[PDB]
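agent> fetching stored inputs for the chloride ion docking request
agent> found them:
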Amino acid sequence: VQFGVMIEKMTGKSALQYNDYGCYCGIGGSHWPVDQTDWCCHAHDCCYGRLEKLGCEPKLEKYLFSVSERGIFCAGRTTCQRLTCECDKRAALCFRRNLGTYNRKYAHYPNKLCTGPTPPC
Ligand SMILES: [Ca+2]
Ligand SMILES: [Ca+2]
Ligand SMILES: [Cl-]
Ligand SMILES: [Cl-]
Ligand SMILES: [Cl-]
Ligand SMILES: [Cl-]
Ligand SMILES: [Cl-]
Ligand SMILES: [Cl-]
Ligand SMILES: [Cl-]
Ligand SMILES: [Cl-]
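agent> prediction call returned; pasting C-alpha cells
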C-alpha cells in the first residue's frame, strides 16, 4: 500500500509492474538478479533483513511520507517506521533511476527461470 504508493509516485508505473519482477521483487529472492531494476529489489531485501536484525518488522510497518519537487520525505512515530520508509525510498529511487532498462518481459517473471548464484548482502 505505502511502498506501492511510493513506487507509483516515483516511476509512473502501477505498483503491480514491480511486485513480482525478476528474481527479487516481491517475496523471497534467490539466484542472480535479471537486471538493474532487479538489483534494486535484491538491495531492498537486504535492507529489510538489516531492519529485522534491529528489532523492526519492516514487512508490517506503516510510515508517513511526502513526494515534493525536493524528493521523498520520510516520517513516522517510531524509528522502525522511519527505517522502513528509508529502505523503501532507496528502492523507489533506484527503480526510477533504472527506468531506462526496465523490461516488461521480466514483470511476473516465473522464479523457476531464476538461475546462478545468490549474491550476498
Ligand atoms: Ca524479494
Ligand atoms: Ca518474479
Ligand atoms: Cl545504510
Ligand atoms: Cl517483517
Ligand atoms: Cl529523495
Ligand atoms: Cl526523508
Ligand atoms: Cl503509530
Ligand atoms: Cl522503534
Ligand atoms: Cl518494455
Ligand atoms: Cl512499462
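agent> quick read of the result: The chain has one domain: 1-121.
agent> awaiting further instructions
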